Design a protein around this ligand. Structure first.
Ligand code: IQ1
Ligand code: IQ1
Ligand code: IQ1
Ligand code: P3S
Ligand code: P3S
Ligand code: P3S
Ligand code: P3S
Ligand code: CL
Ligand code: CL
Ligand code: CL
Ligand code: CL
Ligand code: MG
Ligand code: MG
Ligand code: MG
Ligand code: MG
Ligand code: MG
Ligand code: MG
Ligand code: MG
Ligand code: MG
Ligand code: MG
Ligand code: MG
Lengths: 475, 475, 475, 243
C-alpha cells in the first residue's frame, strides 16, 4: 500500500483526525493526534517529531528529539473514537541522519524479516498467535510503607458464589465459573458471549480475518480470540492492534481487560502461544511425512534452537516478573523444555493437523502477552534460525503429562527458568544468536537488561510480599 | 542446677502448673502443661511424651512418639499466667534408645559447645545478641485467588499523621515518629516508654541481667532491649525466653509485636546483631593491641570464617524470604561481606571498646530474629571455627559508608545473597564446615533445605505480588 | 554536684531506671534507659555508647560509635514514668580520644561559658527565657502528590464558636477565646487554669524555681510559664527539661503541646524572649543611671552586637522556616532591628525595672523555641561579646509603635530577615564572631547550614502551598 | 499580537470545553507535587520582508548571529524577564530539576533539560527557531510575549553573546560544573526585586512604561508574594509541630 492509498482512505472515510502511533521498548503503543488538515505529503517526506526522552527505553533528555515516518500498510479506521479517526503506525528514525532507530521495536521486526531472507533458509516466517486475556469488572492495588494489596473482581468469579448481592446491589443469580472450569460451557454459565461478539465484530471491522472466539479455562472471565496468521512484522502489528481493540471494546462496555500472565492464583494464566512456520518461494518447509509428528529436519532444528536458547530467549518471550508465576505446573503452561505432539503440558506442542504440508507447524507455548510482540517474535525467529544454521538437535520428545512426572524423571529434563532475574542474567551472559545480522544490537540488549533490572526486578524484590506476613509475622 | 533445686523452687513459689517447653526446627517454642502434682522424679528419670509428627522438621506420622527430658538450668517462673506457673525447657530424645535427637535445636547447641572444647581452640563461645522488634497496634493479611493484602498499623506510624482520629475515635495528637527517625527522641515523641519499662521489669523478674532498652530507628514503634551476653546454649535459651516475654508483655498491654526482619517498606528492618568472642581458661582470645581494630589472629580468622561461609551460613542466620528484604542498602543492615571498625554499614562491625581485652569482640550484623537462635548461633560458631582452623584471611577492611561506594569499587566486593533460594542452594552444595564433629548432621541439613523450599520459597514464588499489578495490569 | 551525690539520690529515691539523655544538633533531646543495677562508677569512668549515625547533625554510618559521659548537675527524678526513673544529661565525646564532640550542643554551651571568662569582660552570662506554647486538643497533616493539609484544634479556639457540639459530642458552652484576646481573662474564659497548675507543680517538683504562669494572647490555649534565670549552660538545660515537662504534662492530661513559632495564622506566634545580663565577681555590669533606659556602655555595646549580627545570628535564634511566619507585624514580635525601653514591638526591649542595678537587663525578643537553646544562647553571647569587644554602637532607640511607622521612616531602619534561606546564606558568608575562641567550629556551622538547606528549606520550597491554589488554580 | 490573542482564546476554549463535559481544567504551573508541571514553551523567530532571519548553516545548531544574540538577550535578561514569563509564586515550584523544565540559563539543541532548546528542524531555513522553555501559562501572554521580544531585541542590539551551549542532561551535572552556570531564580520575590532594579530594556521605545512596571511590581508584592509568605505551609507542621 502507498501514501496515496492512505490519503484516499482518509478522504473516503471523512476522517477528522489521524492518530500517529508507535511502540515503546517494553511493548505499549504510544500515540498523538493530528487533524486531517495536517495529514499531507509532508508527513511522509519529513515525518513528525516527538519527545524520545519521555518514552521508555528510548532517549535521554539532552538527546530528546526523535522522528517518526509512517507505515501505510498499517492504516485502519479507529472503531471507538466519536470523531472519525484514522490510526497509522510509524517507524522511529534518527532526526539527523534519518536512519532507522536501533531501539524501535518495529525496526527490529523489519530487520528480522530481512535477515531471514539473507540466510537463504526461507523467505517468510509465519506467526499465528493466541493472546488470552481476562475480562474483569474491577481492579485496585497499592503499595505503602505499612501495607500493600491488590484485588481483581469479576461477576463470574468463583470467589463470589457466596455474595449476598452483585456489586450493583442486584441479586446473585449463580452460574459463576468454577476454577479451571471456564472452557467452555454454554450460556448462562458463559456470561461474556455478547461482549466477545462485540470484540469479534470490532476486529472484523478493522480488517482482521477471524477464526474463533471462546471463553477460556480461567474463572472470572478468561477469554481467547483467534485471527489469521501472518508474516512476522504484520503479525506483530496485528497483535498490538488486537490488544487495543480488546481492551477498548471491554472499556466501552463497562468492563476492564488485562493481558497479564497470571492475575489469578490457583487458576489458569494467560499465554501468548505462537504457532510458527517457515516458507520459501510459496512452499512450506516444516513438513516431512517420515519425521516424528510429521516434522522436517528444518522444523526439528528450529525447535532445537527454541529449546536450546530458552534460558535467554524468555527474556523477550516472558519478559515480566509476573510471567514466572504462570510457569508453574497444572495450568496448561510449560514447566520444562520439551517438545511433544498433542501435548498441552509441553513447551513446544505439535498440533494434530494431518497430512496437509501447509498446515504443519510448531506451537511455542512458553510466551505470554506481557511484553513486546515485535521483540518476542523476532527473538523466537533468531533462536529458531540459529537452530537451523547449527543443526541443533532437540532432546527426544516426551509424550507424557509432564506435570505428573515423578521427581527423579522430572530432574532429567531442563526446567523452565524460575524467575525474571535468571533470564536477564542469562541474556546478559549469552546473546550472540540475537546479534546475528545486527537484528538485535548491543545497545538494545543492554537497555533491555538495564530497564528490567531497575524498573521491575529490583522494585519487586525490595517490597515485602503479603504472604511473608502469613508466614513470618509471628517468628 | 539440679533436679532438687527445681523442686525446691516449685515448692517455694507455690507453683500450680509446670509448662514443658522445647523448640521446633524453624525456631518456635512449643509447650504443654502438666499440674504441679505431676511434676516429680519420674519427669527427670522417664521423661514425657509428645507427638513428633505434629512438630515442624521432626518426625513422620508412623514414627510419631518422641520423648522429652528436662533441663534444670532453664527453670523460670512465668510472669504472665494467673495460675502460678514454672516454665522449663526440655531436650528431645529418641523414645527407644533415649539418645539425643539429631533434629533437636537445643541438642545442636549442646553439640556445638562440646565441639568447641574438643578443638582446643577455646572452651567458651560468648554471644551477645540484639533482637530488635516492632510494637504494632494491629495486623491483618490474606491470600485468595483474586487478591491478597497485608497491613500493619501503629499509633506512632508516620503514615498516620493525616488521620482525622485514632483507631479508638480519640483525637490525633501528633508526635508521630518520622521514617528513620525513631532513634531516639524523648517522650511524647517516644510513645512506648512505659510499655518498654514493663518489658524491662518482666525480663528482670525472670532473672535476665539488663543493660538497656530504647526506641529504635523505625517509625511505628521499633524497639530494642539488651541483656547480658552468655555462653552459646544459655544465650540461645535466653533469646527464646526474651521473645516470649517481649511478645506477651505487648499482648497483655493491648499491643502486638513482630520480630520479622522487614515489616515496613522504606524504613529500618529488625536485625539480630551477634557480638561474639572466644575464651579459654577464663581469658579472652580476641584482643591484640597491634592488630587492626585491636583484633588478634584468632579473631581475624573467625571473621574470615564468617565472611567466607556467608553464602551458605545465611541459610541459618537469615533463614526466611523476608530476611532478604532487609539486606538492602540504606537501613544499617549489610549489603556486602566486609568487616570494618565503627561501621554500621558493614557485615561485621568492630565496636569501639578501647584497650580492655575482655571487651574486644566482633559484631556480626547480618543475622535476624526470623529463625532459630540455637541453629543460628551454632552455625556462626562452626563458620568461625573453620576460619580459625584453616587460617582464613578476610579481605581487607573497608572503612567507608558501604552504601555510597563508587561503582568500580563496589563491584570488587562480594555482595550479600539476594534471596533465600540462593542460600539454600548454596547450603545444599557446600556445608562440610557444619558437619564437622557431627554438630549438624546431613539429616538436619536436608530437612532444613527441604522445609524451606516446600513451605516458604515455593509458596511465595507461586503467588503474584501486589506490585506486579502496579507494574503489569495494563501490559 | 558529684557522682556520689547522684548515687545517693538514686538509692534514696528507690530508682528503678536511669534515663540517659543528650541533645541532637537541631535541638531535640535523645534518650535511652538503663536499669538501676547498671548505674555505677563505670558509667562515670567509661561512659556509654550510642549510634551517632542515627542522630541528626552527628556522625556518618561508617564512623558511627560515639560516647556519652554524665553531667551530675543535671540529675532529676522523672515526674511521669510509673517505674521510678532518674533522668541525667550527658556530654557527647569521641570514642577514641575521649575529647568533647565538636557538634555536641551541650559542649558548645560549655565552651561559650569558658570563652566569656577568658575575655575578662565578665565571668557569668545570665539567661532568663520565656518559652511560650500552645495547648492544643489535636493536630493532623499530610503531604501527597495531589494535595496537602494541616489542622490544629483546641476547644477554646475562636474558630469553634459556631460548633454545634464539642469534639466528644458534649454541648458547646461558649467562653472561647477571641483572636488576640487570651491575655488574660479569668476562668471560665481561661479554660486551662487547672492544667497549667499541674505544669507549674511538675516543674516545682523537678527543682525549678517558679515565677509565674498565665494564658497568653493567642486563641486556642496559648500559654506562658516562667522560671528563675540562670547561667548559660544551666539555663539551656533548664529550657530542654521545661519543654519535656510541659509537653508530657499536657500529654498525660489528654492534650497536645506545640512550641512551634507560628501554628495559627492571624494570631500571636510563640516566642522565646531571652533576658540577658553579664556579671563579674558577683556584681552586675548592665546598669548605668546616666544611660538611656539605665543601660551601661557594656550593655549598650552588647545590644549593638545583637542588632549588628542579627542577619546571621537568627540562623540559630530563629532556625526554622516557620520562624519567619512569626516575624510579621502586629503580634508583639519584632519586624526590624531596633532597641527601645518598654517597647513590645521592638527587637530588643528594655523592661522597666527601676534603679536596682541587679535587675537591669535587655530582652532579646527575636528568638523562638523552634531550635536549640544551647546553640541559641551561645550564639547570642558570641554576638553580644563581639559587640563589647568592638564597641559596636546600636542605632538610636526608636520609642514608637514600630508596626505603625510611616513608610519613609520604616524603610530607613534595617528589617528582620524575610526567610530562613536568607539567614543561612548570611551565616555561611559571615560567621567569624561565632568561631572566636573556637566556641563554634567550622564543621558545626557547615553541618548546620547543610542540614537546614537539605532537610527544611528545600523540602518546603518544592511543595506547592495551599494558598497558591486559592491564588492560581484559575490562571 | 495575534499569537497572544490566540493564547487567550485557546485557554477559554480549553477551560469551557472541559467545563461543559463535567471536568475542570487548570493551567497553573505546578498543581502536582512530584510530577511534571505545565509549561508554555515559546518557539520564537524573526522575519524581515518575508524572509527568515534565524538560520545559518555554519552556526551551532544552524543558528544565525541574529538568532544567537536573541538567545543571549533572553538568557542575559532572564533574572528580570521571568517577572513576566513566570509571574506567579507557583511558577517557581515548576523550576525544579527532573521534570523537563529549566533550572539554569543555558541553551542547547535537542535538550529538554535546557532553558532554551533548539529543536531539530534540518536545513529548511524557514523552520529554524529557538524554544524558550522557561515561561508558563500563569500570567499574561501579551506581556510575556512582548517582554521576551524586548529581551531578545536588546540582545541583538548589544550583540550579547550567550555562554557556550551545554549539550548534557543539566539535572545531572557534577556539583562543581553546576555551580558555575547561572541558575534560574528561586522565587517570585527575587525576579520582582530584579525587575524593579533593572528594566531599561523593557522601556525602550516606550513599549513598557514605568507606570506599568511599578503597578506590576506593586500588584505582585501585595496580592501574591506577601499573602503566601504570611501563611504557614502545611509542610511546616510536618517539620516543626514537635520542636
Ligand atoms: C490462529 C492460530 C494460532 C490458531 C493458527 N492457525 C494456523 C493455521 C491453521 N490451519 C491451517 C491450515 C492450512 C493452512 C494454514 C493454516 C494455518 C496457524 C499457523 C501459524 C503459522 N504457520 C502456519 C499455521 N496458527
Ligand atoms: C548486649 C551486647 C550485645 C550489647 C553486648 N555487650 C557485651 C559486652 C560489652 N562490654 C563488656 C565489657 C567488659 C566485659 C564484657 C563486655 C561485654 C557483649 C559481648 C558479647 C560477646 N563477647 C563479649 C562481649 N555484647
Ligand atoms: C524569667 C524572666 C525572663 C521573667 C526573668 N526575670 C529576671 C529577673 C527579674 N527581676 C530581678 C530582680 C532582681 C534580680 C534579678 C532579677 C531577674 C530575669 C533576668 C534574666 C537575666 N538577667 C537578669 C534578670 N529574667
Ligand atoms: C486451553 S489452553 O491449552 C490453555 C493455555 C493456558 N492459558 C496457558 O498457556 O497459560 N489454550 P489453547 O488450547 O487455546 O492452546
Ligand atoms: C541503630 S542500629 O544500627 C540499626 C540496625 C538495623 N535495625 C538492622 O540491623 O537492620 N542498631 P545498633 O543497636 O546495633 O546500633
Ligand atoms: C505578651 S507578649 O508581649 C507576646 C509575645 C509574642 N507571643 C511573641 O511572639 O513574642 N510576651 P511577654 O509580655 O510575656 O514578653
Ligand atoms: C514533554 S515536554 O518536554 C514536557 C514539558 C514540561 N511539562 C514543562 O514543564 O515544560 N514538552 P514538549 O516536548 O511538548 O515541549
Ligand atoms: Cl526476578
Ligand atoms: Cl527465594
Ligand atoms: Cl526559606
Ligand atoms: Cl516569593
Ligand atoms: Mg487456542
Ligand atoms: Mg487457549
Ligand atoms: Mg494454543
Ligand atoms: Mg544495639
Ligand atoms: Mg539496634
Ligand atoms: Mg548492634
Ligand atoms: Mg513574659
Ligand atoms: Mg509572653
Ligand atoms: Mg517577654
Ligand atoms: Mg516544547
Amino acid at each position: 500500500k502507498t501514501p496515496d492509498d492512505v490519503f484516499k482512505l482518509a478522504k473516503d472515510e471523512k476522517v477528522e483526525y489521524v492518530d500517529v502511533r508507535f511502540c515503546d521498548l517494553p511493548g505499549i503503543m504510544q500515540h498523538f493526534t493530528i487533524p486531517a488538515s495536517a495529514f499531507d505529503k509532508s508527513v511522509f517526506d519529513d515525518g513528525l517529531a516527538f519527545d524520545g526522552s519521555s518514552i521508555r527505553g528510548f532517549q535521554s533528555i539532552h538527546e530528546s528529539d526523535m522522528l517518526l515516518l509512517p507505515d501505510p500498510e498499517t492504516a485502519r479506521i479507529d472503531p471507538f473514537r466519536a470523531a472519525k479517526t484514522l490510526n497509522i503506525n510509524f517507524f522511529v528514525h534518527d532526526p539527523f541522519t534519518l536512519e532507522p532507530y536501533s531501539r524501535d521495536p518495529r525496526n527490529i521486526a523489519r530487520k528480522a524479516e530481512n535477515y531471514l531472507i539473507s540466510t537463504g533458509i526461507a523467505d517468510t516466517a509465519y506467526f499465528g498467535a493466541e493472546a488470552e486475556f481476562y475480562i474483569f469488572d474491577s481492579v485496585s492495588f497499592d503499595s505503602r510503607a505499612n501495607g500493600s494489596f491488590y484485588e481483581v473482581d469479576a461477576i463470574s468469579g468463583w470467589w463470589n458464589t457466596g455474595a449476598a448481592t452483585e456489586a450493583d446491589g442486584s441479586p446473585n443469580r449463580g452460574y459463576k465459573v468454577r476454577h479451571k472450569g471456564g472452557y467452555f460451557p454454554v450460556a448462562p454459565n458463559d456470561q461474556y458471549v455478547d461482549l466477545r461478539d462485540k470484540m469479534l465484530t470490532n476486529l472484523i471491522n478493522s480488517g482482521f480475518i477471524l477464526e474463533k472466539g471462546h471463553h477460556e479455562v480461567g474463572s472470572g472471565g478468561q477469554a481467547e480470540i483467534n485471527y489469521q496468521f501472518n508474516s512476522l512484522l504484520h503479525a506483530a502489528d496485528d497483535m498490538q492492534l488486537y490488544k487495543y481493540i480488546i481492551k477498548n471494546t471491554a472499556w466501552q462496555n463497562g468492563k476492564t481487560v488485562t493481558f497479564m500472565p497470571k492475575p489469578l492464583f490457583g487458576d489458569n494464566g494467560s499465554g501468548m502461544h505462537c504457532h510458527q512456520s517457515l516458507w520459501k518461494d510459496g512452499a512450506p518447509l516444516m513438513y516431512d511425512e517420515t519425521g516424528y509428528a510429521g516434522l522436517s529436519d528444518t522444523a526439528r532444528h528450529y525447535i532445537g534452537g527454541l529449546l536450546h536458547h530458552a534460558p535467554s530467549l524468555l527474556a523477550f518471550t516472558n519478559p515480566t516478573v509476573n510471567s514466572y508465576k504462570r510457569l508453574v505446573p497444572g495450568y496448561e503452561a510449560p514447566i520444562n523444555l520439551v517438545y511433544s505432539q498433542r501435548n498441552r503440558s509441553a513447551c513446544v506442542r505439535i498440533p494434530i493437523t494431518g497430512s496437509n504440508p501447509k498446515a504443519k507447524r510448531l506451537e511455542f507455548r512458553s510466551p505470554d502477552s506481557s511484553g513486546n510482540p515485535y521483540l518476542a517474535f523476532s527473538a523466537m525467529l533468531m533462536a529458531g534460525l540459529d537452530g537451523i544454521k547449527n543443526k541443533i538437535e532437540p532432546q527426544a520428545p516426551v509424550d507424557k503429562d509432564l506435570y505428573e512426572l515423578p521427581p527423579e524423571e522430572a530432574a532429567s529434563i531442563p526446567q523452565t527458568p524460575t524467575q525474571l532475574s535468571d533470564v536477564i542474567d542469562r541474556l546478559e551472559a549469552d546473546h550472540e544468536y540475537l546479534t546475528e545480522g545486527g537484528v538485535f544490537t548491543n545497545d538494545l540488549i543492554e537497555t533491555w537488561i538495564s530497564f528490567k533490572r531497575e524498573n521491575e526486578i529490583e522494585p519487586v524484590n525490595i517490597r515485602p510480599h503479603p504472604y511473608e506476613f502469613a508466614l513470618y509475622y509471628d517468628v
